[PDB]
Amino acid sequence: TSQVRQNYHQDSEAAINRQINLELYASYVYLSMSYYFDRDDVALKNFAKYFLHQSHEEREHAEKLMKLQNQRGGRIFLQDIQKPDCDDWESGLNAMECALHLEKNVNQSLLELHKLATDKNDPHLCDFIETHYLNEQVKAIKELGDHVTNLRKMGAPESGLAEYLFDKHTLG
Template identity: 40%
Template structure:
């Protein structure tokens, strides 16, 4: 009897979902859930950088605050997508979020891009996991961290990640452009913001290259 009640409840719930869902297919729902994972990965990545800059042996509070806000913003993007899926009668499916996965994505972007970066590997994962490793193309050995231009390296990682997220959003938009409402939401709430973020981070990278390390980086940190 208990199982019959549960089955009846599930059947009623499914019927209610069908009342809401209109031209919102499984492929679209899957794609949106994958984008939620990307946004949460970006949030986790930025939180790692926030805690890195807050360390007493780094002591750049402006950067710590900047990346803390960036982490919250990416999480809010994920929450917006979750709310949207529910609004359209879909199913939110949360997947495992690993810091190393996003570091691998950023490293791949640093290594393959035609843009000019200081390194070809994202070092934050090596530092946050306690590893001391020299990786191809750039020295990530944390014992030599005094030679790092911390802010510049972080912003370069950020630019790659923001460009990656933007590219995935563009694919999502193109692949589901027959869904007028989804297209509107992506354009209004996500794509415009990504373009602005990419320009802002690119400007910060140029400024940090001019400022250099030491006093220049310290003064830059004060303005964040």
């Protein structure tokens, strides 16, 4: 047992590890979408840049858990980062919906991590999920609900005139 471990339950330690893997998987998925729009037969230069900057952030979310995992006294345990379910994301409106489905499945995991943190009476881990993740996940899910709504109203995905202009005026 580490000399700095204090009020750090063993079930809370394994949950952080599985959260580390989930955010890494999210970093892979956003990278997968990023370079689908980089293709010549799609070529939405700003969807590639949006989904790339979001693949930079999830890689940054997982480094902050390993930081905390080392602070509280646990030991990080890495697993395989699975491959994304899709290699072709069809269109932009389809990708923006699977990301909203992705951050809704990550928010539920942060929302299952927190209830365990309260049951284990771990007040420091609570306010860590509280401050750095839940307040951002709500904004991001509100962000991807935004774009999907506009894309749908603009006549997506059947009218490519919508994808090009939205790419310039929203993600530009």
